[PDB]
């Protein structure tokens, strides 16, 4: 029944689901602590993305495993759009590139500058986040699994429809619509690249719970009791 | 920037590199021990053609040589992989590295970390199959990889280059949409398919980063920036 929402309904649901902005509480201890607290809010947000909770819990966890760092990154880029040259990790934690860290830092700044140049809108941003959640694990998962992937692709199609709808209501021509859609989805591959480097770094720590476990994510999802 | 969509597709089709073979060296028969050497030599020969292909992607040679090399340094493995996936599309469960080098997953299990990447490639091939990806779409996607993968990791000249690259990417988008419009897809089907194709590029980037990790774990003597520049920096004496 999530696949029966109108585009306007999809947008409203996604705007209403947005997580709060957290505050920060060693720069790296601070950033780890912030990320760890944001994760919980991200899960609550994921559960409100239309179509997401129709998946099995097992598949919801896999999608969160694959997507969470990309989702933290795109949130950071969004918060940082109005702060050229700086990254707004939290309202009390604005860092510039002077504060292997600088490479990712510079890439995030470039992404934030690209969003600024494009005049990325909030309604577009929340569609892009939902695409990351559904797309980032869809290629790295039986009859049941195939049905799940099929559902994922149907939801992704509806989000594409919603993005085009937003662009059309903003007065873009059909050409500008498809050009903008393409520009936004190409940025997602850069966001994937940044996440890949950060995940490589986390795994290299060989430290039990630095990468959120399946069990931790599952606990956060707070499964029904029946 | 002046080309029509039809002329863009024709240029990209005309620029396509050939399908290369693995060596037929009777002194070097295929085995698990020789496999990496055969695959490295194949990749090395493909890279030479890839350089000459890139120079034929409309808009690419308008860039500085320095920026051309950066784009190739950032894209070459993705381009090698998407070509592999394309060659494998019609062979479920196999990777067609060359017509005489068709491997299955159990042959992948020879090396550490190789089967994981192998399965990601197979999944991409399966997705191409499900979408019934067309050759004209494939050549558009490969050019997008070339222009997009390095554009976010690059002065007034740099601003002009990035503007140019974004204009060329926009023309390839127009070209992809035109291919689907000519075929008869509805507008809704056109936007849905464009998005489906472009989302696959995130997966290809992911695979490229895993593959880079794997190649570096080989501890052999990856094309360097200096090496790619030597290859792209052609003279005009021919
Ligand atoms: C999950 N438990 C284990 C910790 O994983 C962590 C996850 C994220 C981060 C932060 C963080 C925090 C909040 C945010 O909203 C976004 C980010 C982004 C990020 C990865 C880019 N990061 C950094 O520090 C960073 C690194 C190098 C260059 C610039 C920034 C820290 C640790
Ligand atoms: C570039 N200079 C030095 C060469 O580095 C090389 C570049 C490419 C490869 C092959 C190769 C060859 C041709 C092709 O078209 C594609 C590929 C794909 C690939 C990169 C993923 N590869 C592997 O073996 C591999 C590994 C794990 C899983 C599956 C495949 C070997 C070495």
Residue numbers in the entry:
A (entry chain B): 306 to 330, 341 to 414, 420 to 461, 465 to 549
B (entry chain A): 308 to 461, 465 to 531, 534 to 550
Reported in the publication:
Estrogen receptor alpha (ERα) is a ligand-dependent master transcriptional regulator and key driver of breast cancer pathology. Hormone binding favors LBD head-to-head homodimerization, helix 12 (H12) binding over the hormone-binding pocket, and exposure of the activating function-2 (AF-2) cleft where transcriptional coregulators bind via LXXLL motifs. SERMs and SERDs are comprised of a heterocyclic core that mimics hormone binding and a side-arm that disfavors the H12 agonist conformation. Rather, H12 packs into the AF-2 cleft via an LXXML motif to sterically preclude transcriptional coregulator binding.
